[PDB]
Design a protein around this nucleic acid. Structure first.
Lengths: 293, 39, 46, 49
RNA sequence: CUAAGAAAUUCACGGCGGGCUUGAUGUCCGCGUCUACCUGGUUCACUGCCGUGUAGGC
Protein backbone atom coordinates (compact mmCIF):
# COMPACT_ATOMS: atom_id res chain seq x y z
CA UNK A 1 0.00 0.00 0.00
CA UNK A 2 2.77 2.40 0.99
CA UNK A 3 6.51 2.59 1.48
CA UNK A 4 8.12 1.86 4.82
CA UNK A 5 9.34 4.75 6.96
CA UNK A 6 12.83 3.23 7.17
CA UNK A 7 14.37 1.12 4.41
CA UNK A 8 18.02 0.09 4.37
CA UNK A 9 19.78 -1.80 1.59
CA UNK A 10 23.18 -3.21 2.51
CA UNK A 11 26.11 -2.95 0.12
CA UNK A 12 26.71 -5.59 -2.52
CA UNK A 13 29.95 -5.85 -4.53
CA UNK A 14 31.95 -5.09 -1.38
CA UNK A 15 35.38 -3.62 -2.22
CA UNK A 16 38.49 -2.94 -0.16
CA UNK A 17 40.92 -0.04 0.02
CA UNK A 18 43.07 -0.42 -3.09
CA UNK A 19 46.64 -0.72 -1.82
CA UNK A 20 49.12 0.79 -4.26
CA UNK A 21 52.69 -0.32 -4.91
CA UNK A 22 55.28 0.63 -7.49
CA UNK A 23 57.20 -1.74 -9.70
CA UNK A 24 58.54 -2.45 -13.16
CA UNK A 25 56.71 -3.69 -16.23
CA UNK A 26 57.25 -7.34 -17.27
CA UNK A 27 57.60 -8.22 -13.56
CA UNK A 28 53.86 -8.55 -12.94
CA UNK A 29 54.14 -12.31 -12.36
CA UNK A 30 56.38 -12.20 -9.27
CA UNK A 31 54.74 -9.02 -7.99
CA UNK A 32 54.39 -9.85 -4.31
CA UNK A 33 57.37 -8.11 -2.66
CA UNK A 34 56.66 -4.82 -4.46
CA UNK A 35 57.22 -1.75 -2.23
CA UNK A 36 54.14 0.32 -1.48
CA UNK A 37 54.21 3.98 -2.49
CA UNK A 38 54.12 6.48 0.37
CA UNK A 39 52.96 10.09 0.64
CA UNK A 40 55.53 12.86 1.02
CA UNK A 41 55.04 16.58 1.69
CA UNK A 42 56.42 19.60 -0.15
CA UNK A 43 55.92 23.34 -0.58
CA UNK A 44 50.58 26.31 2.24
CA UNK A 45 52.40 22.99 1.98
CA UNK A 46 50.76 20.05 0.19
CA UNK A 47 51.13 16.29 -0.12
CA UNK A 48 52.28 14.36 -3.17
CA UNK A 49 52.66 10.64 -3.90
CA UNK A 50 55.02 9.72 -6.73
CA UNK A 51 56.73 6.47 -7.64
CA UNK A 52 60.31 5.51 -6.87
CA UNK A 53 62.62 6.54 -9.71
CA UNK A 54 63.43 2.93 -10.67
CA UNK A 55 59.76 2.03 -11.21
CA UNK A 56 57.71 2.75 -14.34
CA UNK A 57 54.56 0.83 -13.35
CA UNK A 58 51.87 1.32 -10.73
CA UNK A 59 50.07 -1.70 -9.29
CA UNK A 60 46.88 -1.35 -7.32
CA UNK A 61 45.32 -4.30 -5.55
CA UNK A 62 41.99 -4.78 -3.81
CA UNK A 63 39.76 -7.68 -2.86
CA UNK A 64 36.15 -7.56 -4.01
CA UNK A 65 33.55 -9.73 -2.31
CA UNK A 66 30.21 -10.08 -4.04
CA UNK A 67 27.31 -10.98 -1.78
CA UNK A 68 24.14 -11.99 -3.55
CA UNK A 69 20.51 -11.66 -2.55
CA UNK A 70 20.48 -7.99 -3.47
CA UNK A 71 16.69 -7.64 -3.35
CA UNK A 72 16.50 -8.45 0.37
CA UNK A 73 16.53 -5.26 2.47
CA UNK A 74 18.22 -5.23 5.86
CA UNK A 75 15.60 -2.97 7.50
CA UNK A 76 11.93 -2.13 6.91
CA UNK A 77 8.86 -1.15 8.91
CA UNK A 78 6.02 -3.16 7.31
CA UNK A 79 6.07 -6.73 6.06
CA UNK A 80 3.83 -6.03 3.05
CA UNK A 81 6.29 -3.63 1.42
CA UNK A 82 9.15 -6.10 1.89
CA UNK A 83 7.00 -8.86 0.37
CA UNK A 84 6.11 -6.64 -2.61
CA UNK A 85 9.74 -5.61 -3.11
CA UNK A 86 10.89 -9.25 -2.93
CA UNK A 87 8.18 -10.17 -5.45
CA UNK A 88 9.28 -7.42 -7.85
CA UNK A 89 12.97 -8.35 -7.71
CA UNK A 90 12.01 -12.04 -7.95
CA UNK A 91 9.93 -11.47 -11.08
CA UNK A 92 12.79 -9.31 -12.37
CA UNK A 93 15.27 -12.18 -12.13
CA UNK A 94 12.63 -14.64 -13.35
CA UNK A 95 12.06 -12.53 -16.47
CA UNK A 96 15.82 -12.14 -16.95
CA UNK A 97 18.58 -12.83 -14.46
CA UNK A 98 21.76 -10.87 -13.80
CA UNK A 99 23.01 -11.08 -17.37
CA UNK A 100 23.21 -7.42 -18.42
CA UNK A 101 24.27 -6.02 -15.04
CA UNK A 102 26.83 -8.77 -14.47
CA UNK A 103 28.21 -8.16 -17.97
CA UNK A 104 28.56 -4.44 -17.30
CA UNK A 105 30.20 -5.10 -13.91
CA UNK A 106 32.60 -7.49 -15.66
CA UNK A 107 33.24 -4.68 -18.14
CA UNK A 108 33.95 -2.14 -15.38
CA UNK A 109 36.32 -4.68 -13.84
CA UNK A 110 37.82 -5.44 -17.26
CA UNK A 111 38.67 -1.88 -18.21
CA UNK A 112 40.43 -0.44 -15.18
CA UNK A 113 38.01 2.33 -14.33
CA UNK A 114 38.87 1.90 -10.64
CA UNK A 115 42.07 3.56 -11.79
CA UNK A 116 40.33 6.92 -11.56
CA UNK A 117 42.94 9.46 -12.67
CA UNK A 118 45.83 7.02 -13.18
CA UNK A 119 44.07 5.39 -16.16
CA UNK A 120 43.78 8.47 -18.38
CA UNK A 121 47.52 8.85 -18.94
CA UNK A 122 48.51 5.19 -19.00
CA UNK A 123 50.35 3.56 -21.89
CA UNK A 124 49.10 0.03 -21.16
CA UNK A 125 46.91 -1.37 -18.38
CA UNK A 126 46.49 -5.06 -17.52
CA UNK A 127 43.92 -6.25 -14.99
CA UNK A 128 44.35 -9.61 -13.26
CA UNK A 129 41.33 -11.06 -11.45
CA UNK A 130 41.83 -14.20 -9.37
CA UNK A 131 38.76 -15.98 -8.01
CA UNK A 132 39.94 -17.17 -4.60
CA UNK A 133 38.12 -20.45 -3.99
CA UNK A 134 39.51 -21.52 -0.61
CA UNK A 135 42.81 -19.69 -0.26
CA UNK A 136 44.24 -20.32 -3.71
CA UNK A 137 43.63 -19.33 -7.32
CA UNK A 138 40.72 -21.18 -8.95
CA UNK A 139 40.18 -19.12 -12.12
CA UNK A 140 42.54 -16.36 -13.24
CA UNK A 141 41.85 -13.71 -15.87
CA UNK A 142 44.13 -11.36 -17.78
CA UNK A 143 42.27 -8.42 -19.30
CA UNK A 144 43.53 -5.74 -21.65
CA UNK A 145 41.94 -2.75 -19.95
CA UNK A 146 42.63 -0.24 -22.73
CA UNK A 147 41.41 -2.45 -25.58
CA UNK A 148 38.06 -2.82 -23.81
CA UNK A 149 36.36 0.55 -24.05
CA UNK A 150 34.90 2.80 -21.40
CA UNK A 151 31.69 3.71 -23.24
CA UNK A 152 31.12 0.64 -25.45
CA UNK A 153 30.46 -2.86 -24.08
CA UNK A 154 32.12 -5.57 -26.18
CA UNK A 155 31.49 -9.31 -26.40
CA UNK A 156 34.21 -11.78 -25.44
CA UNK A 157 34.58 -15.32 -24.13
CA UNK A 158 36.69 -14.55 -21.04
CA UNK A 159 34.68 -11.43 -20.22
CA UNK A 160 31.40 -13.35 -20.47
CA UNK A 161 32.98 -16.03 -18.26
CA UNK A 162 33.77 -13.35 -15.66
CA UNK A 163 30.23 -12.04 -16.16
CA UNK A 164 28.86 -15.53 -15.49
CA UNK A 165 30.99 -15.86 -12.35
CA UNK A 166 29.83 -12.48 -11.03
CA UNK A 167 26.27 -13.52 -11.99
CA UNK A 168 26.61 -16.76 -10.03
CA UNK A 169 27.86 -14.78 -7.06
CA UNK A 170 25.08 -12.21 -7.38
CA UNK A 171 22.29 -14.79 -7.60
CA UNK A 172 23.62 -16.59 -4.51
CA UNK A 173 24.76 -19.86 -6.09
CA UNK A 174 28.36 -19.41 -4.92
CA UNK A 175 30.69 -17.38 -2.77
CA UNK A 176 32.73 -15.03 -4.97
CA UNK A 177 35.83 -13.21 -3.73
CA UNK A 178 38.14 -11.71 -6.34
CA UNK A 179 41.67 -10.43 -5.91
CA UNK A 180 41.77 -7.62 -8.49
CA UNK A 181 45.27 -6.34 -9.25
CA UNK A 182 45.86 -3.72 -11.95
CA UNK A 183 49.24 -2.93 -13.52
CA UNK A 184 49.32 0.49 -15.19
CA UNK A 185 52.32 1.73 -17.15
CA UNK A 186 52.56 5.37 -16.08
CA UNK A 187 56.28 6.10 -16.19
CA UNK A 188 59.50 6.55 -14.23
CA UNK A 189 58.82 8.77 -11.24
CA UNK A 190 55.34 9.79 -12.37
CA UNK A 191 52.56 10.89 -10.02
CA UNK A 192 49.77 8.66 -8.79
CA UNK A 193 46.38 9.98 -7.67
CA UNK A 194 45.11 8.35 -4.47
CA UNK A 195 41.92 9.47 -2.79
CA UNK A 196 42.31 12.80 -1.01
CA UNK A 197 41.09 13.15 2.57
CA UNK A 198 39.42 16.12 4.28
CA UNK A 199 45.67 18.59 0.69
CA UNK A 200 46.27 15.32 2.57
CA UNK A 201 46.24 12.05 0.67
CA UNK A 202 44.80 8.93 2.28
CA UNK A 203 47.08 6.22 3.67
CA UNK A 204 46.75 3.12 5.85
CA UNK A 205 50.20 1.96 7.11
CA UNK A 206 52.85 4.15 5.39
CA UNK A 207 51.17 3.27 2.07
CA UNK A 208 49.11 5.49 -0.21
CA UNK A 209 45.76 3.97 -1.14
CA UNK A 210 42.45 4.70 -2.84
CA UNK A 211 39.30 4.71 -0.71
CA UNK A 212 36.91 1.77 -0.83
CA UNK A 213 33.99 4.00 -1.81
CA UNK A 214 35.92 5.44 -4.77
CA UNK A 215 36.55 1.94 -6.14
CA UNK A 216 32.90 1.12 -5.45
CA UNK A 217 31.89 4.26 -7.32
CA UNK A 218 34.10 3.42 -10.28
CA UNK A 219 32.88 -0.11 -11.00
CA UNK A 220 29.28 1.11 -10.64
CA UNK A 221 29.31 3.42 -13.70
CA UNK A 222 26.92 1.32 -15.78
CA UNK A 223 23.94 3.67 -16.18
CA UNK A 224 23.34 4.24 -19.90
CA UNK A 225 19.52 4.50 -19.85
CA UNK A 226 18.69 8.13 -19.09
CA UNK A 227 17.29 11.04 -21.16
CA UNK A 228 20.63 12.76 -21.86
CA UNK A 229 21.86 13.62 -25.31
CA UNK A 230 24.13 10.91 -26.70
CA UNK A 231 27.74 11.67 -25.83
CA UNK A 232 27.85 11.55 -22.04
CA UNK A 233 28.11 7.78 -21.69
CA UNK A 234 27.83 5.64 -18.57
CA UNK A 235 27.40 7.31 -15.19
CA UNK A 236 27.28 5.78 -11.72
CA UNK A 237 23.90 4.63 -10.41
CA UNK A 238 22.95 7.09 -7.74
CA UNK A 239 19.32 7.94 -6.98
CA UNK A 240 18.74 11.32 -8.63
CA UNK A 241 21.72 10.43 -10.80
CA UNK A 242 24.17 13.14 -9.99
CA UNK A 243 27.55 14.45 -11.05
CA UNK A 244 28.37 16.86 -8.23
CA UNK A 245 31.78 17.73 -9.69
CA UNK A 246 29.97 18.82 -12.86
CA UNK A 247 27.15 20.42 -10.88
CA UNK A 248 24.47 18.63 -12.91
CA UNK A 249 21.83 16.11 -11.83
CA UNK A 250 20.49 13.75 -14.46
CA UNK A 251 17.18 12.02 -13.69
CA UNK A 252 16.05 14.99 -11.64
CA UNK A 253 12.59 14.26 -10.18
CA UNK A 254 10.66 16.59 -12.51
CA UNK A 255 11.49 14.07 -15.22
CA UNK A 256 10.01 10.71 -14.27
CA UNK A 257 13.20 8.67 -14.56
CA UNK A 258 14.76 8.91 -11.09
CA UNK A 259 15.24 5.92 -8.80
CA UNK A 260 12.40 6.75 -6.41
CA UNK A 261 9.62 7.35 -8.95
CA UNK A 262 10.67 4.27 -10.94
CA UNK A 263 10.75 2.25 -7.72
CA UNK A 264 7.36 3.44 -6.44
CA UNK A 265 5.89 2.78 -9.89
CA UNK A 266 7.68 -0.56 -10.46
CA UNK A 267 6.63 -1.88 -7.02
CA UNK A 268 3.53 -0.09 -5.71
CA UNK A 269 1.62 0.00 -9.01
CA UNK A 270 3.70 -2.28 -11.33
CA UNK A 271 5.06 0.24 -13.83
CA UNK A 272 8.48 0.18 -15.51
CA UNK A 273 9.68 -0.47 -19.09
CA UNK A 274 11.05 -3.73 -20.42
CA UNK A 275 14.83 -3.83 -19.94
CA UNK A 276 16.40 -0.44 -19.28
CA UNK A 277 14.93 1.17 -16.16
CA UNK A 278 14.53 -2.21 -14.46
CA UNK A 279 18.29 -2.69 -14.83
CA UNK A 280 18.82 0.84 -13.47
CA UNK A 281 16.65 0.32 -10.37
CA UNK A 282 18.13 -3.14 -9.69
CA UNK A 283 21.69 -1.79 -9.96
CA UNK A 284 20.71 1.07 -7.65
CA UNK A 285 19.49 -1.34 -5.00
CA UNK A 286 22.65 -3.39 -5.63
CA UNK A 287 24.52 -0.24 -4.56
CA UNK A 288 22.33 0.13 -1.47
CA UNK A 289 21.12 3.12 0.45
CA UNK A 290 18.66 4.73 2.84
CA UNK A 291 15.10 5.18 1.59
CA UNK A 292 11.76 5.77 3.23
CA UNK A 293 9.18 8.42 4.08
CA UNK B 1 -4.19 45.21 41.37
CA UNK B 2 -7.50 45.01 43.22
CA UNK B 3 -9.62 42.59 45.22
CA UNK B 4 -12.98 44.01 44.10
CA UNK B 5 -12.22 44.01 40.34
CA UNK B 6 -9.56 45.52 38.07
CA UNK B 7 -7.54 44.67 34.97
CA UNK B 8 8.06 40.24 22.86
CA UNK B 9 11.12 38.20 21.87
CA UNK B 10 8.83 35.84 19.94
CA UNK B 11 8.08 38.69 17.53
CA UNK B 12 11.83 39.33 17.25
CA UNK B 13 12.38 35.67 16.33
CA UNK B 14 9.56 35.75 13.76
CA UNK B 15 10.82 39.04 12.27
CA UNK B 16 14.39 37.81 11.93
CA UNK B 17 13.14 34.52 10.46
CA UNK B 18 11.11 36.40 7.83
CA UNK B 19 13.98 38.80 7.10
CA UNK B 20 16.29 35.78 6.92
CA UNK B 21 14.25 33.81 4.39
CA UNK B 22 13.62 37.01 2.43
CA UNK B 23 17.23 37.16 1.22
CA UNK B 24 19.51 34.35 0.03
CA UNK B 25 23.32 34.12 -0.04
CA UNK B 26 24.28 31.08 -2.18
CA UNK B 27 21.78 28.78 -0.35
CA UNK B 28 24.17 26.58 1.62
CA UNK B 29 24.32 24.61 4.89
CA UNK B 30 24.61 27.67 7.15
CA UNK B 31 21.25 29.00 5.93
CA UNK B 32 19.51 25.76 6.93
CA UNK B 33 21.50 25.83 10.18
CA UNK B 34 20.19 29.31 11.01
CA UNK B 35 16.66 28.28 9.98
CA UNK B 36 16.82 25.26 12.31
CA UNK B 37 18.29 27.58 14.96
CA UNK B 38 15.41 30.05 14.69
CA UNK B 39 12.68 27.42 14.57
CA UNK C 1 -2.62 11.02 21.39
CA UNK C 2 -5.06 13.62 20.03
CA UNK C 3 -3.08 16.69 21.12
CA UNK C 4 0.55 16.63 19.80
CA UNK C 5 0.11 16.28 16.03
CA UNK C 6 -2.79 18.76 16.08
CA UNK C 7 -0.83 21.25 18.20
CA UNK C 8 2.14 20.94 15.85
CA UNK C 9 -0.19 21.34 12.86
CA UNK C 10 -1.89 24.46 14.17
CA UNK C 11 1.44 25.89 15.39
CA UNK C 12 2.92 25.40 11.93
CA UNK C 13 -0.20 26.98 10.41
CA UNK C 14 0.35 29.98 12.71
CA UNK C 15 3.99 30.09 11.61
CA UNK C 16 2.84 29.76 7.98
CA UNK C 17 0.49 32.73 8.15
CA UNK C 18 2.98 34.71 10.28
CA UNK C 19 6.14 34.17 8.20
CA UNK C 20 5.39 34.87 4.53
CA UNK C 21 7.98 37.07 2.80
CA UNK C 22 8.19 38.20 -0.83
CA UNK C 23 8.51 34.48 -1.42
CA UNK C 24 4.80 34.59 -0.75
CA UNK C 25 3.50 31.05 -0.29
CA UNK C 26 5.19 28.92 2.36
CA UNK C 27 3.20 25.73 1.90
CA UNK C 28 1.99 22.48 3.45
CA UNK C 29 5.19 20.29 3.41
CA UNK C 30 7.01 22.91 5.49
CA UNK C 31 3.93 22.90 7.72
CA UNK C 32 4.23 19.12 8.12
CA UNK C 33 7.97 19.43 8.85
CA UNK C 34 7.55 22.01 11.61
CA UNK C 35 4.47 20.13 12.83
CA UNK C 36 6.41 16.89 13.28
CA UNK C 37 9.30 18.85 14.85
CA UNK C 38 7.08 20.28 17.59
CA UNK C 39 5.26 16.92 17.79
CA UNK C 40 8.50 15.07 18.60
CA UNK C 41 9.40 17.73 21.16
CA UNK C 42 5.95 17.40 22.75
CA UNK C 43 5.82 13.60 22.87
CA UNK C 44 9.33 13.74 24.38
CA UNK C 45 7.60 14.62 27.69
CA UNK C 46 6.60 10.98 28.23
CA UNK D 1 31.99 12.95 -0.09
CA UNK D 2 28.61 11.50 -1.03
CA UNK D 3 25.68 12.70 -3.08
CA UNK D 4 22.27 13.85 -1.90
CA UNK D 5 20.50 10.50 -2.34
CA UNK D 6 17.40 10.55 -0.14
CA UNK D 7 13.78 11.63 -0.23
CA UNK D 8 13.27 15.34 -0.86
CA UNK D 9 11.00 16.93 1.73
CA UNK D 10 9.19 19.22 -0.74
CA UNK D 11 8.71 20.05 -4.41
CA UNK D 12 10.56 22.51 -6.67
CA UNK D 13 9.11 25.57 -4.92
CA UNK D 14 10.87 25.91 -1.55
CA UNK D 15 10.90 29.30 0.22
CA UNK D 16 12.48 28.17 3.52
CA UNK D 17 15.34 25.75 2.82
CA UNK D 18 14.42 22.30 4.14
CA UNK D 19 16.23 19.86 1.85
CA UNK D 20 19.60 20.23 0.16
CA UNK D 21 19.97 20.73 -3.57
CA UNK D 22 20.72 17.69 -5.72
CA UNK D 23 23.37 19.59 -7.70
CA UNK D 24 25.53 19.78 -4.55
CA UNK D 25 27.57 17.20 -2.59
CA UNK D 26 27.52 16.35 1.09
CA UNK D 27 30.55 15.78 3.32
CA UNK D 28 30.53 13.24 6.14
CA UNK D 29 33.01 11.64 8.52
CA UNK D 30 32.45 7.97 9.33
CA UNK D 31 34.09 5.28 11.43
CA UNK D 32 35.36 2.23 9.56
CA UNK D 33 37.19 -0.94 10.60
CA UNK D 34 39.06 -3.18 8.16
CA UNK D 35 41.48 -6.05 8.36
CA UNK D 36 45.10 -5.43 7.35
CA UNK D 37 46.05 -6.21 3.77
CA UNK D 38 48.04 -9.30 4.82
CA UNK D 39 45.47 -10.71 7.27
CA UNK D 40 42.44 -12.43 5.75
CA UNK D 41 40.52 -13.82 8.73
CA UNK D 42 38.69 -12.16 11.61
CA UNK D 43 38.88 -13.48 15.18
CA UNK D 44 36.08 -12.55 17.58
CA UNK D 45 36.81 -13.49 21.19
CA UNK D 46 34.45 -13.22 24.15
CA UNK D 47 33.73 -14.98 27.42
CA UNK D 48 30.34 -16.33 28.48
CA UNK D 49 29.46 -17.09 32.10
C1' C E 1 -10.68 80.69 34.67
C1' U E 2 -8.56 74.23 37.94
C1' A E 3 -11.84 73.49 47.16
C1' A E 4 -8.34 78.61 42.77
C1' G E 5 -4.41 81.76 44.42
C1' A E 6 0.98 81.05 49.28
C1' A E 7 3.99 78.36 52.21
C1' A E 8 12.08 75.95 54.63
C1' U E 9 10.49 70.89 59.78
C1' U E 10 14.96 70.98 62.35
C1' C E 11 17.77 69.00 64.96
C1' A E 12 21.26 64.28 68.64
C1' C E 13 21.79 59.18 69.90
C1' G E 14 26.41 52.45 72.26
C1' G E 15 21.29 46.97 71.35
C1' C E 16 24.06 44.46 74.21
C1' G E 17 25.46 39.39 76.64
C1' G E 18 25.45 33.15 76.45
C1' G E 19 24.85 28.56 73.88
C1' C E 20 26.53 20.38 71.62
C1' U E 21 21.23 19.01 66.96
C1' U E 22 21.44 14.23 67.48
C1' G E 23 21.42 9.17 66.10
C1' A E 24 20.32 4.37 61.56
C1' U E 25 19.65 2.80 56.81
C1' G E 26 20.53 -2.78 50.50
C1' U E 27 18.06 1.02 44.24
C1' C E 28 17.53 -3.27 41.99
C1' C E 29 16.42 -5.68 37.33
C1' G E 30 16.65 -5.99 30.49
C1' C E 31 18.65 -3.99 25.88
C1' G E 32 20.62 -5.29 18.00
C1' U E 33 20.73 1.27 16.90
C1' C E 34 21.13 0.14 11.76
C1' U E 35 21.90 1.62 6.16
C1' A E 36 25.01 4.09 1.15
C1' C E 37 28.55 7.56 0.10
C1' C E 38 34.35 10.16 -5.78
C1' U E 39 37.36 16.13 -1.80
C1' G E 40 37.51 17.52 -6.25
C1' G E 41 37.34 22.45 -10.57
C1' U E 42 42.76 22.11 -9.14
C1' U E 43 50.19 22.99 -6.21
C1' C E 44 50.36 30.43 -10.37
C1' A E 45 56.82 25.28 -9.49
C1' C E 46 62.37 24.08 -8.88
C1' U E 47 65.13 27.46 -12.77
C1' G E 48 68.13 29.81 -17.02
C1' C E 49 70.93 29.95 -21.65
C1' C E 50 67.23 35.98 -18.50
C1' G E 51 66.45 41.13 -19.23
C1' U E 52 67.99 42.38 -11.85
C1' G E 53 66.31 45.92 -17.50
C1' U E 54 57.88 44.37 -15.10
C1' A E 55 57.61 42.29 -22.17
C1' G E 56 61.88 37.47 -22.23
C1' G E 57 62.77 31.96 -22.54
C1' C E 58 61.34 24.26 -21.43
Amino acid sequence: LSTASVLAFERKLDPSDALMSAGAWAQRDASQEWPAVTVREKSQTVDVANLPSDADTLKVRFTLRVLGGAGTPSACNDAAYRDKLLQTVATYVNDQGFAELARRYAHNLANARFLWRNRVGAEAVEVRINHIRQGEVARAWRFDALAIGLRDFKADAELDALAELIASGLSGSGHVLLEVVAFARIGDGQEVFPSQELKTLYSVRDAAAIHSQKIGNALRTIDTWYPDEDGLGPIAVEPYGSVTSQGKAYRQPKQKLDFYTLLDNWVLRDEAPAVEQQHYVIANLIRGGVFGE
Amino acid sequence: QRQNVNAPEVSRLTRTLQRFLAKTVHNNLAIRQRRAQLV
Amino acid sequence: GDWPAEVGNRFANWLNRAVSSDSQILGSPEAAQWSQELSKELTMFK
Amino acid sequence: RGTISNRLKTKDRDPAKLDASIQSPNLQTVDVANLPSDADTLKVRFTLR
